[PDB]
Design a protein around this ligand. Structure first.
Ligand SMILES: *Cc1c(COP(=O)(O)O)cnc(C)c1O
Ligand SMILES: *Cc1c(COP(=O)(O)O)cnc(C)c1O
Ligand SMILES: *Cc1c(COP(=O)(O)O)cnc(C)c1O
Ligand SMILES: *Cc1c(COP(=O)(O)O)cnc(C)c1O
Lengths: 338, 329, 329, 331
């Protein structure tokens, strides 16, 4: 393949670090060696995270066209819209964010802390609609894009999670590249990668990047959508389009896309008692925080996989920390005593 | 001087990046070149920050001694106690934190979000209220050995080493850049961050270029504390000179109205910096130093052509305890 | 029967008023006349409500005995415990409250506003998680004599007396209005409210006119509690009859989806009633009985011309723990 | 005087009860007998309070004219706007409220709990401004085809705003008849002033005007005192007061208003706790907590004559406690 053909705008500090999770590994029995690649600490742009890696490939296009505004969308505690807001201010572009409560949840300060609080400080026009206002049905997405034009600007459309976008899967193809370039130094290859998936272009990019060396099925996606079927399909689809985009010379098989469905419950945005125990265990053994919406569910998955001996003894598992920690602020009551 | 003599435990990713703040500089007239050194992005341990750099030199001692518990103290939204809670967890040590409301503030979620929330998830025993002595005692009485970490790590013998290193790091990046920064803006409250810098740059004749921006709103005491720690740290590292009072610069114009409370200028600074650079600052610390730097460039207090290095010390998570203020941005 | 045999400690202003809900009635078709008996405005003690009418029959016993501390239990936004705290203060009694999270609901200020906030201001010892006996024992060991008040005051020998008195009061008021009510709608969870009503109205042949609306989301358990208590109370007051299953009507269609959680119908019912009558109801209890009453009317389940007495038991302060749901109305 | 010349629309249950505060009295030495008249419990309309008593004399006019919308204004945790919202819903009228940040306070749920939460549920169009709204509100109603009835801050600066509490003194006289004695003093919290004004006029009728001890909660003493005086004289002329309101007739203590309007001092807090714990009677940190603080300190300083009977008017305001949850987290 050839990813280098596509321009990458620097929005990160460079390659992200891999750290051993020795204490967690030892705590789980010592039979599996856990590591974490910190995508969550990749940028100075409002905490960055996986979405910021994806954005490096969309901005060149946004810039080539004469776009002066970035337009995106997401739920109230969306990490994506917060990263779009920071990237926009940084690039000197305006930003319009379409938002609605996409979770059956109602914390007293849900729309005023964490991610959304940052996007507002960052200068984004946060168009948060009232409950019952179904933006997706109403197609508010498009009216937002039209309002920018109508106002005299030129919008660049960034869909949910950056995923269903032609360039949305490139970033994580690069992620596989990085991983190989780093395994070169370790003198070994991680047997598995654990990654949280919802809109899909993260794991999709990984799948295309690791297919290139026969490890596509080593990417253990952990659904956090609670709608596994649609999510599995979205990752597959995005992976086949991206594979084509970068000239991979392999057809992505249904078997190349692994998405565990055991740790997504009860719904998108809601943690289960397992998610919570996972967050606390990982944080208390490594000083590494994860959230109740995304990373906490994929940490719950990994720890559970290990505990269930689903990992062949001696394996080295690379946990991809995609970010999302700021969302913890919207679930304060749950952690009031830790 | 000889800093290399003291053991530094790795708790950070490595030297912190220095980024240009091209848009902000342009916004303010372009007569001054602003940059930011990102201490707020130095670690994977619960967001880290300046305190984490300070702690790298205190940890070997805690370890050399048979200490099994890290004990610290700070206000409800203290960044320090949160970084200590994350280092403890990472090191396999227990953590006791003495938190008290050191601010005339009373937000509904003040003690449930941001820093303190992370400390509880990270497993620290968060005690809300001499509480200090009592905590230390309880650890021993419980059959443990505690390592006492004072407020902000500042009144600790090893507390100023971290930032002597910062100065060292800066000369090394200046070599690479092929140039040197003319000034350094840094927020100061407990004091060992600026004291460390003061000593570190006295080494090349730039202690007085370190521009401290008071955020304690009790300038006299803060200035004395930075002075004292700096002199003591200089002695610790074998500096050839005796730190003088003129080596310590502390602007008092941006600390209003009290510690922990932002003024309208603080909020405007936070908004301008975020909206021009995508770099967030908080209403307690960094927003005030950012306010100061901006005001300095604007009043034309920096000579035209200067290169100012803003030390971003962290603190962003505390933004969560000030949600009403920013409800509309 | 003779309720008069039992002492009643005055904790309310006196008989609660009955108001017509002409606007809501008109809005729903004008075929069914709706009224409201305001138990929610029955006392000067922190808003009172139905639990306060219950406590009037219990206090004498606590006093007969030399009790000095009232001890109760309930969820975090329990109305029962707030009223016990207020009754305690007014009596000069200590108060210990056992509060656990009985609801699968998480809101940042859930344990800091509304009912629990008042109980703390009122001086009660609010203990957040058998915690029950533990609390009682702690009182004794402390040197005080506790009076145990079970959840909602319901499963207690004197727990049904208050609402037997309610039926008596209603009769006296019907004599004054010159007409009788055909049905009463009442929210039910721990059961002694409806139980008292069942016993009081069985006396004039209208036990089955008391339309209970389940809010526990555990219909079977709640229906059994109402029956059990109604039988015990009927024996206490000398009712000349057995309480049969036909005497206990409990609608199950409106409790969803769980105890403490409103459904969309609950919310629409709270909004409709507030906007047509200026009478507020809450998302845990009254909003569900109000939803039930509105729906019964809408479905034509009440004969045309019926006069329906809605018993508003209180609970409004709990609205504060559900701020986000109502942020835009 | 003749208050009966003006119609009164029923929004309350009827006369408000007076209760002895025996425990609080004894707690303070037993030298002064304290009582409370419960204006805070006067209505089934979203808790009511003193503003609802005032509204009974304005609504007849709103109705006389062809008004279909009640428009009012107040701070974020305004009690006034909530009662207006409840009264409008009850009357079948629309309601538009102009809420501003009148307090230097920034609690996380300040604009979503308590009074303002109830106004939204009550169906009012609640208009907030990011950190002339009044005229835009009024015009917006006309433009929509309606007819607004304007209700100024606290109902005070209005021609009928003082009648409600003239009647309060009339009510207290009837109750004193049954009591066989007359109260020696009345303690009332004052901010926009027509509550104390109505009282000053009603008690002037029997030479007890200077017995109405207003307790300032505005932190702008001079301005509040002056507004009480003016509203009192205007009201006195409205009802036919046979005497004239003298400057000396308006008593307003300024020692308990601090540090600012909408912000409690530690004395306010102790007073709320003490009163709540000895009587089971709650007061708020903005208004009643301050007048209660006043009455307690007065008693404590022997400022009331031994044996005096002091009537504390509890005006309401308790729902605002939800906006100050952190200071009461441990009680
Ligand atoms: C968006 C996101 C994910 C999932 O990434 P997708 O590409 O949408 O599957 C996981 N974690 C965090 C923190 C995210 O913001
Ligand atoms: C502690 C702190 C400061 C001030 O540093 P001192 O060494 O105490 O003077 C500034 N910013 C942040 C984010 C801090 O946590
Ligand atoms: C307790 C309560 C109920 C239910 O009454 P029970 O006697 O427990 O069945 C209904 N409404 C409110 C407001 C309550 O506090
Ligand atoms: C408005 C109000 C006051 C002050 O009354 P004014 O007539 O404005 O002087 C006192 N307490 C409460 C609860 C109020 O709502």
């Amino acid at each position: 393949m050839n990813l280098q053909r596509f321009p990458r705008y620097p929005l990160t500090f460079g390659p992200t670090p891999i750290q051993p999770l020795a204490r967690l590994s030892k705590h789980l029995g010592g039979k599996v060696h856990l590591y974490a690649k910190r995508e969550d600490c990749n940028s100075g742009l409002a905490f960055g995270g996986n979405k910021t890696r994806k954005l490096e490939y969309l901005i060149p296009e946004a810039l080539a066209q004469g776009c002066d505004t970035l337009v995106s969308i997401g739920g109230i505690q969306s990490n994506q819209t917060r990263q779009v807001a920071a990237v926009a201010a940084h690039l000197g572009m305006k930003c319009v964010l379409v938002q609605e409560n996409w979770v059956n949840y109602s914390d007293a300060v849900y729309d005023r802390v964490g991610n959304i609080q940052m996007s507002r400080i960052l200068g984004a026009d946060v168009r948060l609609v009232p409950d019952g206002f179904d933006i997706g049905f109403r197609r508010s997405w498009e009216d937002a894009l039209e309002s920018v034009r109508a106002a005299g600007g030129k919008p660049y459309a960034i869909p949910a999670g950056c995923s269903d976008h032609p360039l949305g899967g490139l970033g994580f193809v690069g992620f596989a590249e990085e991983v190989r370039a780093q395994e070169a130094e370790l003198g070994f290859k991680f047997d598995y990668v654990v990654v949280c998936s919802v809109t899909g272009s993260t794991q999709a990019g990984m799948v295309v990047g690791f297919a290139a060396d026969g490890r596509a099925d080593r990417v253990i996606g952990v659904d956090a959508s609670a709608k596994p079927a649609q999510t599995r399909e979205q990752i597959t689809r995005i992976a086949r389009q991206t594979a084509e985009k970068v000239g991979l010379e392999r057809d992505i098989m249904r078997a190349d896309v692994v998405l565990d469905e055991r740790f997504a419950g009860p719904e998108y945005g809601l943690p289960n008692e397992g998610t919570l125990e996972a967050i606390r265990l990982c944080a208390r053994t490594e000083g590494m925080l994860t959230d109740p919406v995304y990373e906490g569910k994929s940490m719950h998955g990994m720890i559970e996989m290990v505990r269930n001996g689903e990992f062949p003894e001696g394996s080295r598992v690379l946990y991809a920390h995609l970010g999302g920690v700021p969302a913890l602020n919207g679930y304060s009551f749950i952690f009031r005593d830790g």
